[PDB]
């Protein structure tokens, strides 16, 4: 029965995603902010895709690392072929959805990953940040406020929906994100920002003494 196999495979993907750390991406006054629960200092699940496009993921490290590399390859090639301003987070989200669906159907083991693509406006331009969440099978969803990935997402989503605030500052957004993720210490956290005030490249990591003072 093909349907039984499909349900079993979907259950496997849900179980793989569930036994993973949670990642939160939230919009604030200056742009987009990513917080990830990562004790390891070398492995990073928060990364830049392109000038104004950032990437977050939750799940098995090698799979979304390969997805990250493929997305970077696609974005750079697209930017070289036409222009830097022709690359948008929508195209990257669509490419990720198509690739994930094709891997799910054709490959023997589906990727146990959950992806989020975030995009901010260009310099000197006003636009609401865009957040796209992509599941293992290829489902794509636009979230206007926040994205939660990995682990038990129900308490995290409830806490965020209770504590989310539009036009929040950097400190307030970080405090709200870490408080919602608790439902921790300065270490074992990866914090990054897509800062819309930057001229060309928005992605910037906040680690070390800067994160110590900020948190």
């Amino acid at each position: 029965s093909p349907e039984q196999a499909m349900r079993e495979r979907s259950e496997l993907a849900r179980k793989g995603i569930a036994r993973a750390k949670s990642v939160v991406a939230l919009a604030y006054a200056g742009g987009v902010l990513f917080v990830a629960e990562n004790p390891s200092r070398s492995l990073q699940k928060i990364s830049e895709l392109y000038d104004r496009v950032g990437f977050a993921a939750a799940g098995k490290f090698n799979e979304f690392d390969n997805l990250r590399r493929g997305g970077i390859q696609f974005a750079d090639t697209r930017g070289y072929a036409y222009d830097r301003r022709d690359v948008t987070g929508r195209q990257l989200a669509n490419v990720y959805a198509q690739t994930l669906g094709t891997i799910f159907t054709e490959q023997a083991k589906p990727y146990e990953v959950e992806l989020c693509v975030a995009e901010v406006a260009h310099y000197g331009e006003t636009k609401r940040p865009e957040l796209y969440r992509i599941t293992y099978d290829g489902s794509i969803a636009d979230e206007p406020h926040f994205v939660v990935m990995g682990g038990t997402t129900e308490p995290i989503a409830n806490a965020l929906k209770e504590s989310y605030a539009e036009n929040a500052s950097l400190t307030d957004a970080l405090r709200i994100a870490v408080a919602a993720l608790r439902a921790l210490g300065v270490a074992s956290l990866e914090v990054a920002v897509l800062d819309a005030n930057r001229p060309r490249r928005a992605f910037r990591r906040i680690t070390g003494s800067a994160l110590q003072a900020l948190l």
Binding site: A97, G101, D137, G138, S139, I140, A141
Partner: peptide
């Protein structure tokens, strides 16, 4: 599968 994003049916919308």
């Amino acid at each position: 599968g994003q049916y919308l």
